[PDB]
Amino acid sequence: EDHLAKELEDLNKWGLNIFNVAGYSHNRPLTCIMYAIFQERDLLKTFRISSDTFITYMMTLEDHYHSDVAYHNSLHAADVAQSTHVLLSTPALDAVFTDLEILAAIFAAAIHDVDHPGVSNQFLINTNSELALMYNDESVLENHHLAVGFKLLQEEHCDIFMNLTKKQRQTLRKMVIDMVLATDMSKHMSLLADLKTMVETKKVTSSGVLLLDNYTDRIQVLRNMVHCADLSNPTKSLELYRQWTDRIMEEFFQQGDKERERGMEISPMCDKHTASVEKSQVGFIDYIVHPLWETWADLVQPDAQDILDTLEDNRNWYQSMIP
Ligand SMILES: COc1ccc(/C(C)=N/OC(N)=O)cc1OC1CCCC1
Ligand SMILES: [Mg+2]
Ligand SMILES: [Zn+2]
């Protein structure tokens, strides 16, 4: 209440503590943070979105994240949305995006993992799940998250984009699909290679603000921004990062337990009897998170240097915990 307002004073900051907001919002972190973000950016006024309609959609959307899944629940979506909200304000990106693009990125972050079952795409493919049969083994979960999020927009009492232009709805939909499909980790290397090429040919105004010519360049940055937000856990304070690590390992180890039950091959990092939690985060940082953030930093330099410093410190802490 008074605690919630205090925590929300850091809405525009990387140090915002989403666990605290969840505790003071009746376990509706996604709904609460999305509402705070939309008010801060005047998006309700700009896109003539009624508050009742927005809350109804957000609450329904939130209720579609599974509370018994350790990591991929509404708290993660709320964290990715808030992080995206901060990245969109990076000084190097000042005024580069339209209001419609800003709206799509945050919307995309909110819905990006909805109805996640707590098991990976590969698990769904190997167990011949209905989801994998439906989506022909390609970005199974991610096509699913999009389908649910857009499906929920179909009822009049939930259509937050009702007052957008027809062309605006088409553009937003195209951008949102692009962004969520880009959160599929199997596309990470490809996304990173393309980000490195954009850094290579980076152009700016005299005042250090990126110049993004066509829709193509703008959406490539937005895709990558949402992907960094999704892989932002190790760039946050150690206290936050460790809670995030505890949650993903609980989810991964539960997957391993389901694999063992069924006589399947146990995915190595999902095997509770052998996997080092500490070693695994070091590898995650060295081979995936750092290379991505190093490249993001280059694109928006020097705005992300503090994030990179925190990342290195967190990496060394996990390393120091390994005997
Ligand atoms: C806090 O650590 C993590 C945070 C987020 C993830 C992401 C990649 N979740 O899984 C996928 N494939 O979506 C993965 C993380 O770590 C994994 C588990 C051990 C090392 C890599
Ligand atoms: Mg996902
Ligand atoms: Zn995610």
Q: Which of 3, 66, 72, 157 is catalytic?
A: 72
**Binding-site residues, ligand 1, Cβ < 6 A:** 185, 233, 244-245, 248, 252, 269, 280-281, 284
Which of 242, 189, 205, 225 lies closest to 304 in space, CA to CA?
225
- DSSP E strand stretches across the chain: none
Burial letters 235-257, b for 16+ CB under 10 A, else e: bbeeebbbebbebbbebbbbbbe
**Domain span holding position 322:** 1-323
Which amino acid residue places its CA nearest to atom 14 of ligand 1?
A: 248
State both tokens at 272.
Answer: 């509770």
| Integer Rg of the chain from CA | 19
CB 85 within 8 A of CB 37: yes
Question: How far are the Cα atoms of 248, 249, 261 from residue 70, in angstroms, in the given order?
Answer: 7, 9, 19
Q: Which two tokens stand for residue 217?
A: 């360049």
Name 318's bridge partners. Answer: none
User: How many domains does the structure of the chain reveal?
Assistant: 1
- Residue 224 identity: N
DSSP code for 163: T
Query: Which atom of ligand 1 lies nearest, measured to the CA of 283?
Result: 20
User: Which residues lie below 8 Å from residue 112, measured CB to CB, with a gap of 6+?
Assistant: 77, 80, 142, 145, 179, 180, 183, 226, 230
The CA distance from 28 to 302, in Å, is: 35
- Please tell me the distance between residue 163's alpha carbon and the centre of ligand 2 in angstroms: 29
* Crossing angle of helices 290-299 and 305-321, rounded to 10°: 170
From the list 47, 84, 28, the residue with the least C-alpha distance to 221 is: 84
Give, for ligand 1, the residue of 248, 255, 277, 321 to mutate: max count of ligand atoms closer than 8 Å to Cβ. Answer: 248
DSSP one-letter code for 245: H
Resolution (A): 2.1
Method by which this entry was solved: X-ray
- Rounded to the nearest angstrom, the distance between the alpha carbon of 289 and the centre of ligand 1 is 10
Owner of token pair 């205090």: 6
Exposure string of 153-177, with b = 16+ CB inside 10 Å and e = fewer, is beeeebbbbeebeeebbebbeebbb
Residue 289's identity, in one-letter code, is: V
DSSP letter, residue 266:
P
Nearest residue (CA) to ligand 1, atom 11 = 185
Q: Are 204 and 130 in contact (CB under 8 A)?
A: no
CA 111 vs CA 78, 148, 162: distances in Å: 9, 8, 18
Q: In the block, which residue shows the tokens 């063992």?
A: 260
Q: How far is the CA of 101 from the centre of ligand 1 (A)?
A: 27
Q: How far apart are CA 195 and CA 175, in angstroms?
A: 17
Cis ω for the linkage preceding 117 (within 30 of 0): no
Q: Please, what is the Cα angle at 185 between 209 and 146, to 5 degrees?
A: 85
Among all bound ligands, the one having the nearest atom to the CA of 73 is 3
- CATH number, domain of 64, equals 1.10.1300.10
- Report whether 251 contacts 70 (CB < 8 A): yes
CA quadruple 60, 66, 226, 286: dihedral, nearest 10: 170
The closest-lying atom of ligand 1 relative to the alpha carbon of residue 183 is 13
CA distance 151 to 158: 10
Most ligand 1 atoms within 8 A of CB, residue of 284, 285, 287, 310 to mutate: 284
Beta bridge partners of 210: 204
β partners of residue 204? 210
Distance, in Å, from the CA atom of 238 to the CA atom of 242, rounded to the nearest integer, reads 6
Residue 74 makes CB contacts below 8 A (sequence gap 6+) with 27, 28, 29, 30, 62, 65, 67
Determine the Cα–Cα distance for residues 128 and 262; give it in Å rounded to an integer.
Answer: 13
Nearest partner of 18 among 299, 185, 240, 317, judged by Cα: 240
72 flagged as catalytic: yes
Instruction: State the CB neighbour count (10 A cutoff) for residue 196.
Output: 15
State in Å: Cα 33 to ligand 2 middle: 19
